Amino acid sequence: ARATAGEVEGSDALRMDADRAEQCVDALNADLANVYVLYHQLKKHHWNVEGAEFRDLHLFLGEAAETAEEVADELAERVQALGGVPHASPETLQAEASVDVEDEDVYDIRTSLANDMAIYGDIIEATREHTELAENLGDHATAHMLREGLIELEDDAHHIEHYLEDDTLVTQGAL
Amino acid sequence: ARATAGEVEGSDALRMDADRAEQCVDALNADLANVYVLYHQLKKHHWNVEGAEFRDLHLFLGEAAETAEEVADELAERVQALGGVPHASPETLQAEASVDVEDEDVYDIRTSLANDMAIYGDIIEATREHTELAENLGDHATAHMLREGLIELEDDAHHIEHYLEDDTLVTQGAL
Amino acid sequence: ARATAGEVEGSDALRMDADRAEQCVDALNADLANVYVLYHQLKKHHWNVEGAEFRDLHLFLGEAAETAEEVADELAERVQALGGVPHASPETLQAEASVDVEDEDVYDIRTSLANDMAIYGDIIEATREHTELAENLGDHATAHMLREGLIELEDDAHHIEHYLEDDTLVTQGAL
Amino acid sequence: ARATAGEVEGSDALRMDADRAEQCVDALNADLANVYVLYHQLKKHHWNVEGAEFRDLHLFLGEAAETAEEVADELAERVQALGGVPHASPETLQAEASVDVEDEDVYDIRTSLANDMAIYGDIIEATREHTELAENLGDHATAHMLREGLIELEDDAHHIEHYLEDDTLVTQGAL
Amino acid sequence: ARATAGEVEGSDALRMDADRAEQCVDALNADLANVYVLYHQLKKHHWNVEGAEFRDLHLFLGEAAETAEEVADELAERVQALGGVPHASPETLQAEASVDVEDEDVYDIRTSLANDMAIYGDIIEATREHTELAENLGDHATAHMLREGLIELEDDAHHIEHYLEDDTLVTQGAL
Amino acid sequence: ARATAGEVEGSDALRMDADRAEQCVDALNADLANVYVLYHQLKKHHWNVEGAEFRDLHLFLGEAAETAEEVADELAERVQALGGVPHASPETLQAEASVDVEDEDVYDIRTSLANDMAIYGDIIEATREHTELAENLGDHATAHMLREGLIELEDDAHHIEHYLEDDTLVTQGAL
Amino acid sequence: STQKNARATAGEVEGSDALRMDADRAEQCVDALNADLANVYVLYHQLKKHHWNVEGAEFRDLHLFLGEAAETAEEVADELAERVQALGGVPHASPETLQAEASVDVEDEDVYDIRTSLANDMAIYGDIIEATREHTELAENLGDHATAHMLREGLIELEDDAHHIEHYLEDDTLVTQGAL
Amino acid sequence: STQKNARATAGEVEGSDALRMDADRAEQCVDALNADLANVYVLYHQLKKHHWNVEGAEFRDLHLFLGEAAETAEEVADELAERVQALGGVPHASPETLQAEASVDVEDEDVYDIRTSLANDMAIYGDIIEATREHTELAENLGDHATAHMLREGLIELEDDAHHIEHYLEDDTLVTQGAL
Amino acid sequence: ARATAGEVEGSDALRMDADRAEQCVDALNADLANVYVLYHQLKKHHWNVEGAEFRDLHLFLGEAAETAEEVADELAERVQALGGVPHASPETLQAEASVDVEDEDVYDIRTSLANDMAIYGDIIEATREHTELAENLGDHATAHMLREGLIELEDDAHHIEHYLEDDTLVTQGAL
Amino acid sequence: ARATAGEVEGSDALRMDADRAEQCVDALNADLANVYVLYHQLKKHHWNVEGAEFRDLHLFLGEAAETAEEVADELAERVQALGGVPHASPETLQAEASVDVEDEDVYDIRTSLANDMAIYGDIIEATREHTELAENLGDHATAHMLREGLIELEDDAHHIEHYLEDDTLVTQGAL
Amino acid sequence: ARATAGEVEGSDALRMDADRAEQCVDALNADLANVYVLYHQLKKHHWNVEGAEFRDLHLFLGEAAETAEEVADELAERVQALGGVPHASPETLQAEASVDVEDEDVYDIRTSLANDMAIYGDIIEATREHTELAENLGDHATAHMLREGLIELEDDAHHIEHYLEDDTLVTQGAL
Numbered sequence A, B, C, D, E, F, I, J, K: 001a002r003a004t005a006g007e008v009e010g011s012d013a014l015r016m017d018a019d020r021a022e023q024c025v026d027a028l029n030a031d032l033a034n035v036y037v038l039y040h041q042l043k044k045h046h047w048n049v050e051g052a053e054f055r056d057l058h059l060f061l062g063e064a065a066e067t068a069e070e071v072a073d074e075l076a077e078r079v080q081a082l083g084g085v086p087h088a089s090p091e092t093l094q095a096e097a098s099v100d101v102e103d104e105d106v107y108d109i110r111t112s113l114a115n116d117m118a119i120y121g122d123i124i125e126a127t128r129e130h131t132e133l134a135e136n137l138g139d140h141a142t143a144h145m146l147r148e149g150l151i152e153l154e155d156d157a158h159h160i161e162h163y164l165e166d167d168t169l170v171t172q173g174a175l
Numbered sequence G, H: 001s002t003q004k005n006a007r008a009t010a011g012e013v014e015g016s017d018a019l020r021m022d023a024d025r026a027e028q029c030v031d032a033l034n035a036d037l038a039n040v041y042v043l044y045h046q047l048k049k050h051h052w053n054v055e056g057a058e059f060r061d062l063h064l065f066l067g068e069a070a071e072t073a074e075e076v077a078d079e080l081a082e083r084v085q086a087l088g089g090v091p092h093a094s095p096e097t098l099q100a101e102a103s104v105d106v107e108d109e110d111v112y113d114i115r116t117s118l119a120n121d122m123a124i125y126g127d128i129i130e131a132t133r134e135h136t137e138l139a140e141n142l143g144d145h146a147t148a149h150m151l152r153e154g155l156i157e158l159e160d161d162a163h164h165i166e167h168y169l170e171d172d173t174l175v176t177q178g179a180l
């Protein structure tokens, strides 16, 4: 074994002591778990979405998943850079995630999207707290990275909010 | 002051006398004002569109705005090339525009789109008259430029017409 | 006249005797006729689609048509490579096609899509039989090409199936 | 039936009344039919061309077909934009076409090319009349679009004319 | 009316309550108004710039305008994301702007540039205050977005400062 | 619930009855589970790899993960296309996977790589059986897709085999 | 054994643990793949030869076609060679070995007119085409679907070029006695 | 005064009217930025040195990494220098000035083995990394959010490369005594 | 006048005295005149080429002309860099050219090509002498530039030689 | 036969007499033979390289082979341009090559690389002599081309030299 | 130490003995020192340039610096390839440079540019001598590389010469 899960050694290269590093790592690993479950659920909805606006949603969800996957990669690599061990196995990621995950059945798109929006909100609030924690610790690179990811997550969260809004070009007439 | 608003000196480089130039400039500046209000309203709807088909409309409207902005740039620069002064300030553009502009409230997408379609029609009819005026004046470059813009405007006007058509994949069943 | 419609001479370059070649050509030409009518009907729906989700469908249908056109080109060229004569004129293509083609009236998008889905299924089933026929004849290049096209056709057929599914973001409320 | 073949309703979006629109639509649909038969014959020659200069002709014809297909798409969409119904089925396109189409046999390249050149000329002369008709009707976007297509068609028609010219690098000696 | 100008509902998706959201929205809308007047004035100078270094300035100003337009789009969309209504009409934008706008006459380039530099400074100082306001409110995505825009605006403001500096390659001799 | 996990309805669009479809779906879902655990373990090694050749391995592993992720997407979408429900949650994927997954500790690169190579072999052997199963069922598109993925997986499996081979440029002297 | 200099001996096939391919099955594919490799590389070199030497009224188009044909042949050879290596075998490498192991006929060092040159190449393609068809079946039968798939992917590109040459040699032309 | 030849004197900071930054506040950022610039440019030159000289079993990958690291360091320096200039200051320019003003240690002109070379560079990164963190706070405190943001943008790229070097120096390898 | 035709002042920037510079300039201007007549004749043949292989020749000649135009630009700019005055007007270029130019009639392609090949040979031999003259003068940049152009010119000269060779795919049979 | 191996006719197009041409051709053909054996051996090592740094070497060797293949193409075409016959068959190339070629067994990477480095040195020294021979003959295009290739060959030769140097990041500890 | 500054071992790979190699290395290292001081001074002027034409000069100087940096990289790597040690530290580079470097004050653009032009001339003359030295030593790759760099340096040197010429579009009137 080269490293033990749960341990945080910090980094000499990045001049980050283990105490300070572990504070960021704990926050980052928690985010990582949630972001990866989000990724998998976005993939699920991407694969299963059907209906009148399925292709646009399919494409949106695919892009949302890609973004979530990139954020997770950033998070995981920052955890590793800070001398920590990023959650890796699917089982570990879900167990460590605090957000709710749909069961294996497929729900209609409005329900599916609403579930995803709930996951985003949770991650969004957490990321805001984590960027402050990082800035407070003087880890400006982590803080900056978190904000860079936060803006992409909020964009997708906002997109879902608009998909669920009570407007449409459809009329009873065209119906 | 280098040039006075309302004045048209023509161009020696383009061999266009002030009399003939002013005829085109008057037409071009009128179009410019309408095209820029269109641009701003398309931006408005682009920003605010919500609902089941919001992302596709968001993207369409963004592209429509970009097109409107490019047409305005063409118009403004042609006015300047002909020795005239293109309407510049937001206040001047709206005051000089003849099309109707929504008030600051946000309306549902069908209403919003319908308002935009009305603006396009006005600009479309005007541009047709202006291309003839230009050809008649022997200003073939202006005439050509107007047609180049006309085709892009009509494409977007047509798109909105189709968005508002009484058809949909939606059924009472899926509802 | 350089070649007579209906004749299959095989190919010395491809070491394919006329007997074996004609078996593939008969299958390929039948597919070609159906694929080209599909192409034209997809173009029709691409041009005419209107409504709340018309732009996304317009784009999808345009891409579906392009794919159908490329498959036909592949089919036609393989027929020619095997010493045969690919169906060419519009009249010949339709007459040789076994799938149903809408009359010249324009139907609502759900009806239009459903008609196209029926054409895909027919072509899909036929292509599956033709790839086996080709493999059995030892014409692995034709077999491979058919599968390459089959996967693109099935993707579009699947897309239409999802467009017609009983789900939507629309609610009676937004309506 | 959402729309009936032969009917032209004009467009409110494009401020084009049905009377004026129908004049353009009749012209556009006639061109569409001819352009699509041209497309299919160009495809035929593209597939079948053989001989000393076949690869260059194969590529040229492929490009000529793509151009013809884009012109047809433009024509068809303009017809639809003007409230009309573009000819769609292969059978309808050929029946509505006024140009001559080769029978299903394959002819030598000089004969093939000559037949295509005849189709181009017909379309070229018609398009010139149609652009005037459109300008006269004040439909400058249609007029402009026709000229844009006319220039591409004339380029390919000219190419064929040069391919058939009485010159060559070949000498009796190299023969 | 789907939304009323001046109202801010916050966002459930982004877990941003209306109280906090309105604080950011008020700041963002003020910036939007100023950024859009800047955009229009930059366009004005872009169109009208003449003289020995006009082409380089024309290109610079065009790029400055594009940047201002993208910043405005960011601002407007963030306002919308936070449940607010972004200023849209030209008239509203100018009325809501606090920066000074040139009258419709065209001034020499040094005067024009100096006026623009004054607009930038105002926006720059405001954006700095607004990023702090956002960070204080814990809206790190807005804060980050503001800084991203601030750096681009300061770059262009700096460019103008250098264009106006008292140095040149010109000598009395070359004169 | 729009669809229940474990159910397979086949597809009318793809002319695939539920009986035949379920046979492919069972195979595809099993592969999906294994491919996604592979993806996550490849990501793990990508993040954690250290040492003399870490950067090249980091890049290789990143690419291997991306490939595994695309294969999973293909598999999942084919399952969905065939009327089935692709395993989605991290917990479900791992539970349904038959390959071994490392515990959360980080091992040296040779051990890590060896574990991954074992996962590839399992997936490789399974995919070979599944392509035959698909061809036998006459589902040539699934068969083809499996082979397309098989070749990419075997390439990466082979890469790992070479990374572990007993050769190196290193000498006791340079040591 | 532990002391041979060679890391691998030409002719040996060890299969692959990574690809779960035993030496017995692997050697069957390797024998087929190496034979194809030899022929494909001689084809590559002859296509290069004709690419370099083609002259006349339609030389530039042929020059470009032949260059592309050579590139394709080179890529197919690379695929074949790497698959051989992946299956635990040793791909024919030296020019001398490639030609010796090739079964197709190669022109002598003189330069022939383009019709003759092209005809010779078409003969090489046919040989490779027929062999590749047999080899894809052999691979599918052995359950080596990745090799089978790769062979078909290459087969389609080779047949396209073989077909092109066939058309270049067809009895048609825009030339007339008049233009002559 | 009106007659000095120099357009600007090294060490002076006039702030900026365009950026609404007074000289007092500007000079605080400029002092920080110029110090970073000096260190970043010596880093750049040492990374170039190692890029040029790296040899051995993994030299090509290191050559490419070091080249990219140098490019990144050069871009950061350009950003720093231009921000200094934007704030009315004079960025250190000459090679002699840059090194003299740098606080990090620079290798002498001899070439050392890659592990030693890399270790020296890692030490330079840490120094710059710690300094940049302090400087971003200084800038935020001064309300110069554009400088603060720019510093973080550069900090993340520098930390990435510092981290890469750390991994290159880690005690792991695919090499075994057997392959040796 | 800013500079007088025929005068060569050398360059202080390039440390090239007028004496040495004038030797290169005389050589470069002679080449420039010939290269530009070549350019214009290549354009002529590009425009006029007809026959069985016209399209390939049209494209080749177009590329040959572009190459000749770039070489002339290089030559002219080097002349200017060395303090000289490059021949500019069409009349001056032809008068200063030593190669033969066809009269205004259009000749068959073999004759046209043969004339061009003669021009290339002349330029090729001259360029070889000029590169030696430059190297001897120690003007290695001019020498290098000449060789860079020489290789492109020889490539095109060689192409024409091959177009004129006594070989063809054509047979009396296909004839 | 159109041309006999061993004969050199020079070129009228390139103004190169057979006497002078044959001197360059003899040099070029010798280089061609060596460069192509190098190409094939680089391919061999590219295919077979295994071990801790195999992927980087695999990629390097692939690129080295591509470079060698391009140099051979240049050489062969220059030989043909000068009226000669480039060595073509694999058998001829190896027989005409003076460098040593490994037997068909696969050696460890250090041995393989060392063998390649020996081939490069031979080609490098020869190319230096050949560029002088060409310059002396006044064939500056051949001379220039040789140097262009020489620089790429020396770069790869140098790369191999560095791969074989006595340094590594590996330590007895990591071992 | 792995290598000692000042030592030149030549290269076995490149068949370059230490004696001959050291002659090139001494020349190359001298050029490297000058080119890097040039690079840094070009950067200085790039950063500091202000005034009426600053943006164009800013861009030019940036490009000039990039070019100087690439030339230095080439030089340094060639030194290393020949078994030498390229000057590395800023202090060493300046100490080893023979060109004059401005003190740390910022001068007006004309003065700055004139200083740079002086540096170019020095490097230009030196590079000419060094290419001859290399050719004489039979090191054609170094010779070729030097000329490739010489042409880019002379282009920039020439650009500065033109920036300083006594011409301008400015008139006393516009002033």
Ligand SMILES: [Fe+3]
Pocket: A073, A077, F046, F062
């Ligand atoms: Fe990553």
Ligand SMILES: [Fe+3]
Pocket: B073, B077, E046, E062
């Ligand atoms: Fe503009």
Ligand SMILES: [Fe+3]
Pocket: C073, C077, D046, D062
């Ligand atoms: Fe085709």
Ligand SMILES: [Fe+3]
Pocket: C046, C062, D073, D077
């Ligand atoms: Fe279309």
Ligand SMILES: [Fe+3]
Pocket: B148, D148
């Ligand atoms: Fe146009």
Ligand SMILES: [Fe+3]
Pocket: B046, B062, E073, E077
């Ligand atoms: Fe937007």
Ligand SMILES: [Fe+3]
Pocket: A148, E148, H153
């Ligand atoms: Fe950023």
Ligand SMILES: [Fe+3]
Pocket: A046, A062, F073, F077
């Ligand atoms: Fe997907």
Ligand SMILES: [Fe+3]
Pocket: C148, F148, G153
């Ligand atoms: Fe494929």
Ligand SMILES: [Fe+3]
Pocket: G078, G082, J046, J062
């Ligand atoms: Fe390869």
Ligand SMILES: [Fe+3]
Pocket: H078, H082, K046, K062
């Ligand atoms: Fe810069």
Ligand SMILES: [Fe+3]
Pocket: I073, I077
């Ligand atoms: Fe130029």
Ligand SMILES: [Fe+3]
Pocket: I148, J148, K148
């Ligand atoms: Fe070059």
Ligand SMILES: [Fe+3]
Pocket: G051, G067, J073, J077
């Ligand atoms: Fe070639």
Ligand SMILES: [Fe+3]
Pocket: H051, H067, K073, K077
């Ligand atoms: Fe480098």
Ligand SMILES: [Mg+2]
Pocket: A080, A081, A083, F050
């Ligand atoms: Mg670590």
